[PDB]
Design a protein around this nucleic acid. Structure first.
Lengths: 176, 53
DNA sequence: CCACTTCAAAGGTGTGAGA
DNA sequence: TCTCACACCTTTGAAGTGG
């Protein structure tokens, strides 16, 4: 049946093995890397909606001290549920499979009263992105473990900062 | 450069989601409505048709 | 119609200050 | 911890030129 493949998985894995941090801000901040996928299996004449969703990886607060993460409490009562309806929705399966679905215009905010329909997160908690394919009973969900991350207000692990700077084209004024 | 208004782009985009090719007078009905030269609409569709590939 | 180009404006990066 | 203005980059996209 329907199956989904994480585009640029290798790059994601270079991040998943340091502790992926994502910056959140009040205006909303993009994800790097970008979440893109190839989809296969959809009935090409059927119309679908593709939502993205971000959900708690665990129920802990965290702290970065002494070049290490460590649990320092229970995850606080986060946060006004919100979805990201992919802007090509709704669309024939054919349109979706044609080439990569990109979730690059999705933005993360720390603002709990946000007026932009951006996804709201809580600083210093781990999160897990989910894609939902819904028809326009049945909507299926795929998780890629390596896309899990920790929301931060500024980078902690300086390794990550440099990992973003070498690989994110908008950050090129910071390279060598 | 003058970019197209929030209004216009949305209305062009919706039409493209439907028909990705327009006829000669179809470009005119749409031009007036959004208040752009029918040239600009023709070129928009041409540019959108390209870039979506 | 398509193929590609042109080149400012729009706008995304981490910084480092100052709360 | 969080916020914000910079500097410095990319992408965007209407218009250009030729097929």
């Amino acid at each position: 049946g329907i199956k989904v493949f994480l585009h640029e998985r290798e790059l994601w894995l270079k991040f998943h093995e340091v502790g992926t941090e994502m910056i959140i801000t009040k205006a909303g901040r993009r994800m790097f890397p970008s979440y893109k996928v190839k989809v296969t299996g959809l009935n090409p004449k059927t119309k679908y909606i593709l939502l993205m969703d971000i959900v708690p990886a665990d129920d802990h607060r965290y702290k970065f001290a002494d070049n290490k993460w460590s649990v320092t409490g229970k995850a606080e009562p986060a946060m006004p549920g919100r979805l990201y309806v992919h802007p090509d929705s709704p669309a024939t399966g054919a349109h979706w499979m044609r080439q990569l679905v990109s979730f690059q215009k999705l933005k993360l905010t720390n603002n709990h009263l946000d007026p932009f329909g951006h996804i709201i997160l809580n600083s210093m908690h781990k999160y897990q992105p989910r894609l939902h394919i819904v028809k326009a009973t049945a909507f299926c969900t795929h998780v890629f473990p390596e896309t899990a991350f920790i929301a931060v207000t500024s980078y902690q692990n300086h390794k990550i900062t440099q990992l973003k700077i070498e690989n994110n084209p908008f950050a090129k004024g910071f390279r060598g | 450069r003058v970019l197209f208004s929030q209004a216009q782009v949305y209305e062009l985009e919706r039409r493209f989601k439907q028909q990705r090719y327009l006829s000669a007078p179809e470009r005119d009905q749409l031009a007036s409505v959004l208040k752009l030269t029918s040239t600009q609409v023709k070129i928009w569709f041409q540019n959108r048709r390209y870039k979506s590939k």
